[model samples]
Target: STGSATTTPIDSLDDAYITPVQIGTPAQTLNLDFDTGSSDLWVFSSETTASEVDGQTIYTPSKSTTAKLLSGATWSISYGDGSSSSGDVYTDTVSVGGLTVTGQAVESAKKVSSSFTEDSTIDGLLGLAFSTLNTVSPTQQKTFFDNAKASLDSPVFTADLGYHAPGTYNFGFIDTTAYTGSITYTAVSTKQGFWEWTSTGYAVGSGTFKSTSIDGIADTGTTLLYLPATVVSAYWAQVSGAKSSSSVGGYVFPCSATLPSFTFGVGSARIVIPGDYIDFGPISTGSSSCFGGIQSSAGIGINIFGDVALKAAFVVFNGATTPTLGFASK
Candidate 1:
């Protein structure tokens, strides 16, 4: 049987998608960010300090008879965006869509940084990356997808993210109707516990496709498209008033500036990112300066095809065999 779930945007943020997941015996439902960049299913829980808990809902393990403590097990995670959360561990049944996984490791956050506490809408995070990336102590934990893969007819999942609209994530089977045209398949390497691949090259606007070859990861948890410094500079050079600011930490252009479309290579097929998507809203509320959604991945070590880039196409995370990524236009 196949399992599918709907993911909705968080108002005007367009930074992340939220999906509903049930945890524990009595089945406490929480809205979680399905992150493909990390592998730790963490949530706000009863163990959290009152001062640290804001408007987010908390999962009370004591209320569930089936919940069991891992005993001395703890976990902590830090993101590239500087956000972090740390807490104890519990074993319980967790369900996503219609698929259920028994004895799944559920990290209960006792401490959260301002990045998580201030975001009232996000109660937790459901990590979909490789099981090796899980943060549990002593023994690493398998993600919900890994636990459910054995029961699936096909160990594959697809992500169809939209701009300011609802999208769908399908498991066990691919929904051909979700995308148009044929999918271009590329091999992926997971040595670093990430869906990493190498791009043949890229092009800015109507410019020539340079065979520069860039290594990057497909990450759903990240909000922006991060590329090499030289590639970022090449795109910015086409924008008349674009300039990099120390305070902004990225390239910013006048709100009225005309941006160029960006394209990245995948095998022989090229995935095009429209010009409009490059303007990532404004710098602030009612500000005349806008931040470029495409930024330099200089210090980050690897480039990231984040939501800004993923939303432009339909992506299939194929788990069969050596693991491959397929992309097609929607």
Candidate 2:
């Protein structure tokens, strides 16, 4: 099979990929988005009356025959962009991709932003990101993995994102077609959900960009990969026919010529970023710049490898295993 590891047998794999399930009262049956970035399972509910919920799926405990909201428990989440939401805790039966778990604890958000309220496609986010960065902190630290791990046939897990447009988001079984290699495990720091690491420095066209090493984190919740300004400028300089476009808030660029194939060497792993990801199509910015993925962050000590970069690798978070994080061929 293409992308399958030669060492492992497909038949020997007994794991089943977990997906979302349905539960709760007749008043509201909420669909959940499994997220790893944040822990708490929250859904916009009909209980919220301050503002209208546009695209969000609202959950109601009264509607489902088997649903029950945890009484007296408070829940809330605040984002880096200054957005916040709050609600009461509830416990109910939940389903995902035909997998069902009973007595799952969740939060019902009463307040939400327009971005959340406007999107009709997704019902609610199910944070499958990490167990440490959970919202139900100080309590049980409830998580999708924590709930599903016990019920799933195998302890392994994998997320397969369908390219642009709607994708199939799966949990539990790793799609062997997605990657090839033994799971390269990494230790998870107890601090934040962000995967922390010390970089060996930059690489271009599979070559080292600089000798100066740096430390940083990888986060799927973030949209862009941010680097120190000096590294950013130096990278663009290496690319042929590359120019900065004022469009996309200078986060984007344009190049009549193709840039050199480059990769970022993180520790022992070399991650490549293709040129097509740099050629972001149309832009509202008048500068007509290419929507290049990499952007320069002036003296920004925080180096973030965002979703675009994360998608290229088969990432595994093993809370079941000691140290808790492993990367390998999907």
Candidate 3:
């Protein structure tokens, strides 16, 4: 089966992207963040306490005849910022667009973090990463994409993330019209369970391409592009008013300053990110100082090709037995 669905940014800043998913027999539709960084289809549920739920649409598995407790199974996820969620597991009918997975494992949040509770627009998270990354204990469960592979026209999904606009996630097939030029395929190192690949290198503005292997994960769940300190430092150096101030937080610059476009390579293919895309938004209410969408990976260790990077190209997550990644200009 093949299908396409729209994923919309939760807020104007695009802190995250959410796609609607229908669960249970009658279908409890909830908007979920399609996270490629982690593996867990967890939702705010009846099991969640009132304090933890901030107007989030929740799944009440008990209301569905198809829902069944996966006895002795539990899952937990902890965020780097001390935010977390954990709960019991239940199997129910889950649908993403026209794609369906029966008896799909759906985690019901019993306890949650304050960070999640603060976001009213986000109901939960639907993980699209490798099933090997699933947090379910006693026995790890397969991901929805992994479970639906057999029925798909091809075991793959494509992402066309946008800059403050709605994007599309196409399952089982590639939409040729969504991108231009032939797709540049790259080898994926899935030993770490993420869509890990090596980017040939990058160039700031029209600077000469710096050919080097930059290993990173293509994470739809993440909001920014994080690269090595040397690379990010080189980028900000080109901007006159840029500064990595502790008071301002990370990289910041005058809103009026001109921003140079960024370019990255995949094989001989070069993908350019417009400078305007790098000017995320003002740091505060109407403040002139703006935060950069690109950041240094010094603290994070691994470089992350997040939304800022993915939005610049049409990405294909080839979930074949031997997974690879596809990138194309749009």
lDDT of each: 0.90, 0.57, 0.91
When 1 and 2 are scored with lDDT, the better candidate is 1
TM-scores of the candidates are 0.97, 0.77, 0.98
Top candidate on lDDT is 3
166-261 per-residue lDDT for model 2 (tens digits): 234445565656667655555556466655655567765555566666555655544456777777777678765465555445444453557555
Which residue ranges in model 2 land beyond 4 Å of their true spot?
Answer: 1-21, 25-33, 137-140, 165-170, 181-183, 206-214, 239-250, 255-260, 285-287, 296-301, 328-330
In model 3, residue pairs whose N, Cα or C atoms come closer than 3 Å (at least 3 residues apart or on different chains), thus clashing, are none
Q: Model 3 Cα displacement at 323 (Å)?
A: 0.5
CA shift of 142, model 3, Å: 0.9
Residues 1-330, model 1: lDDT tens digits: 568889888766577888888999899999899998899999999999788888998899999888999999999999999999999999999988777889999999999999888888899999988989999998888998888888887998888988878898888988889988889999899999998888888999999999878889999999899998999999999999899988988999999988999999888888888888787878988999999999999999889999888888899999886899999988
Query: What residue pairs are clashing in model 1?
Result: none
Worst lDDT run of 10 residues, candidate 1, spans: 9-18
Error of 2 at 15 (Å): 30
lDDT, candidate 1, equals: 0.90
Deviation from native of the Cα of residue 164 in model 2, angstroms: 2.5
